[PDB]
Amino acid sequence: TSVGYAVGLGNVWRFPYLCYRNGGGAFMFPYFIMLIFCGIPLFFMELSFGQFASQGCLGVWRISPMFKGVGYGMMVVSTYIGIYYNVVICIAFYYFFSSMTHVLPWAYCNNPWNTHDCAGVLDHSLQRTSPSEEYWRLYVLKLSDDIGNFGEVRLPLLGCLGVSWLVVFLCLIRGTATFPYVVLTILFVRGVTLEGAFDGIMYYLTPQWDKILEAKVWGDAASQIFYSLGCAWGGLITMASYNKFHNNCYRDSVIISITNCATSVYAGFVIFSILGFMANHLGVDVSRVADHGPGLAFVAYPEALTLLPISPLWSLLFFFMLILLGLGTQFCLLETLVTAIVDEVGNEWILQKKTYVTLGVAVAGFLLGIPLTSQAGIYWLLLMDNYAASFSLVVISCIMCVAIMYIYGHRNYFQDIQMMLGFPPPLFFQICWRFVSPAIIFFILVFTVIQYQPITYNHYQYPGWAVAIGFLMALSSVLCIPLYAMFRLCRTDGDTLLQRLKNATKPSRDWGPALLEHRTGRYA
């Protein structure tokens, strides 16, 4: 049809380092399996569910009011996600402003912010370092040893974060595509004909059959397959309201998922190409050429731009594109939260004064993002990526999927699609929804708990209190489900622990098509 949009920050910065962190090519096959049997079939459901009634992340839960806690917990995940994008976005603002010189600062192994073991590509001891790494570590952030020393605050980064939180606010209060693909193609053309790039593509292929029997690989695969698509992420169910009741959500689900996966894999090729040259010209293997840190795009992409002629223009376009991409994501991600919180109160004094709540949500993010921009920035930003976005979105999505088709009913939802789409859901979709995906999610979740929780599960050797804080934050996103369930069970008429459950999970009196002339049969 046309461009499938997508191509967010979860396709240029997240996947390239997640794949390297999960051992490289051992992550691709589980990713394909989890996208085929827990991806697309977890997207058509959300599209149909939103197209049912024109609502957002909240309000749609009129099927089982006791389960409305899923919606409230869904925002909590978005809050922990829509706060650490700007820190990454702010770093992009520190590179756009830095690329204002005839020669790029991260392109010469002679600058004062280097060491004696620095290596070069243009024109001792052990563990040779590429000139790009000794810019992200010793000059941008000045990272300390660990969380043990908080350090001072990087003034340039703190200043750039203010603009990151300001431009979004100004653009929000006042009231495109095919560009990433051409830049990615230009970056792909270079760095592959260079000698040594062949080794960097093989490591992106030939998956290791020995390592596929683990838990971390599939755990990350489920998170990535749900994070990029938008399942329980916010900003996906809400826009389903702005869709015609007779729109082919099946075609959109088929096209968007494939396009997003193709873009992510293409970014994988682009990123892993430079790693081969790094390994070749440094003298180490591909698996240990870099570090398993949160920033790999800022370590691999800049060197590719250096090799290209007339590099400053390319850098200016690339980082400008990245900034616009991040702002485009954050715009919707924050606007949906503001709309939900405004509609939640349902009052008048907090209705016409929407500017104040917009300032309040924006000011809160600015203040709470201060400690991320400091001498211990990498570790704190990286802590909120393992125990904040992983193993919570998948759990919430699985619980929602079970609740829709095992309490409301499997015949009802299947019958409804006939009244929306001409042809019934395919027999593949019926089997995958009912048994396959919930069983896979349950098996992964139980296997990550029964086994594989030793000290070696700590891939990063975090201290006990820090991992305790991360575990506490992880629970908060998922622990909202039973609390609201009990809260609503209190209000229900207290007969016995059999009738209260039925009296609190039945559909409400306004569950049906959003508009009239569509409620004529069962939903009339």
UniProtKB/Swiss-Prot annotation:
Record topological domains on the Extracellular side: 98-152
Keyword tags: Amino-acid transport, Cell membrane, Disease variant, Membrane, Neurotransmitter transport, Phosphoprotein, Symport, Transmembrane, Transmembrane helix, Transport
Top-rank taxon, per record: Eukaryota
Entry keyword Mitochondrion: no
Annotated membrane topology: Multi-pass membrane protein
Subcellular location: Cell membrane
Keyword Membrane: yes
A Gene Ontology biological process term: glycine import across plasma membrane
One Gene Ontology cellular component annotation held by this UniProt entry: presynaptic membrane
Transmembrane regions: 1-18, 25-45, 77-97, 153-173, 176-192, 217-237, 264-284, 307-327, 363-383, 387-407, 427-447, 467-487
One GO molecular-function entry: glycine transmembrane transporter activity
Disease: Glycine encephalopathy with normal serum glycine: An autosomal recessive, severe metabolic disorder characterized by arthrogryposis multiplex congenita, joint hyperlaxity, lack of neonatal respiratory effort, axial hypotonia, hypertonia with pronounced clonus, and delayed psychomotor development. Some patients may have dysmorphic facial features and/or brain imaging abnormalities. Laboratory studies show increased CSF glycine and normal or only mildly increased serum glycine. Most patients die in infancy.
Family: Belongs to the sodium:neurotransmitter symporter (SNF) (TC 2.A.22) family. SLC6A9 subfamily.
Subunit structure: Interacts with EXOC1; interaction increases the transporter capacity of SLC6A9 probably by promoting its insertion into the cell membrane. Interacts with EXOC3 and EXOC4.
Function: Sodium- and chloride-dependent glycine transporter. Essential for regulating glycine concentrations at inhibitory glycinergic synapses.
Descriptive protein name: Sodium- and chloride-dependent glycine transporter 1
Species annotation: Homo sapiens
Full-sequence portion shown in this chain: 112 to 667 of 706
